[PDB]
Paper text:
The heterotrimeric RNA-dependent RNA polymerase (RdRp) of influenza virus is composed of subunits PA, PB1 and PB2. Transcription of viral mRNAs occurs through a unique “cap-snatching” mechanism. We initially screened metal-chelating compounds by CEN enzymatic assays, followed by a cellular phenotypic screen and then optimized the chemical structure to improve the pharmacokinetics and safety. This culminated in the generation of the compounds BXA and BXM that target the CEN in the PA proteins of influenza A and B viruses.
When this residue is mutated to the more polar threonine, the structure is essentially unchanged in both the FluA and FluB structures except for the side-chain of the residue. The side-chain of T38 is orientated such that its methyl-group is in exactly the same position as the CG1 of Ile38, whereas the OH group is orientated towards helix α3 allowing it to make two hydrogen bonds to the main-chain carbonyl oxygens of Met34 and Leu35. Thus, substitution of Ile38 by Thr38 reduces slightly the van der Waals interaction with the compound since threonine lacks the CD1 methyl group of isoleucine. Furthermore, unlike I38, which does not change conformation upon BXA binding, T38 (and M34 in the case of FluB) have to change rotamer to accommodate the inhibitor binding. These two effects (less favourable van der Waals packing and induced fit change of threonine rotamer) plausibly account for the reduced affinity of the inhibitor for the I38T variant and hence the lower susceptibility of viruses bearing this mutation. The reduction of susceptibility to BXM for the I38T mutant is less for FluB compared to FluA. Since the direct effect of the substitution, as observed in the crystal structures, is essentially the same in FluA and FluB this suggests that the contribution of I38 to the affinity of the compound is proportionally less in FluB than in FluA.
Author numbering: -1 to 62, 73 to 191
Amino acid sequence: MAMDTFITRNFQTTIIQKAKNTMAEFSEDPELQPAMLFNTCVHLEVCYVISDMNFLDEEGKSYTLRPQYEVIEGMPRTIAWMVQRSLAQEHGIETPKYLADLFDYKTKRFIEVGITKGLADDYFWKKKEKLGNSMELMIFSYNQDYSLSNESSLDEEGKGRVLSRLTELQAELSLKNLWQVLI
Ligand SMILES: O=C1c2c(O)c(=O)ccn2N([C@@H]2c3ccccc3SCc3c2ccc(F)c3F)[C@@H]2COCCN12
Ligand SMILES: [Cl-]
Ligand SMILES: [Cl-]
Ligand SMILES: [Mn+2]
Ligand SMILES: [Mn+2]
């Protein structure tokens, strides 16, 4: 099985289209770069999972009514920048200098999501070298490890559902001799 075929079988059409659109903005070609398309699909999928299972009520109380998180990843950078900058103004906070992956309506922070094949901690601190504390960080590995800058933001159950998806994907890729494509 080829990577492109795996992608089309394991990811929703919306995610695939967005990740390709994004690679195009950077003029990376999805057909020449199937590992990048895979990685971008996973990252965007994780973002969507996080936003899909956190809601808030009229007062501001959590629940596993309105979405807790706005996904900024997956839009064209020009729109994404207008959206980041406008959310930040409308909540009276600093606009980060990097483009974020999510906005948390509860804590009023921008979130950077990271996916890694190494250890979650190594990728946490690397991200923090650039971002300082402009954003919260949510780092997931394919080795069942995580590294949140705020443990409450995401529930212990939810971290585990993202970790299991990743574990699912690594398993199938390995079964199909495609994991080596990513390493
Ligand atoms: O927003 C991201 C980004 C992240 O948010 C991230 O967590 C990791 C990596 N990123 N990068 C993603 C990306 C995202 C997920 C997995 C791998 C890659 S690999 C580089 C690349 C990305 C997107 C399109 C493209 F053509 C690329 F070459 C670029 C880094 O420059 C800001 C935009 N961006
Ligand atoms: Cl950026
Ligand atoms: Cl940089
Ligand atoms: Mn991003
Ligand atoms: Mn990210």
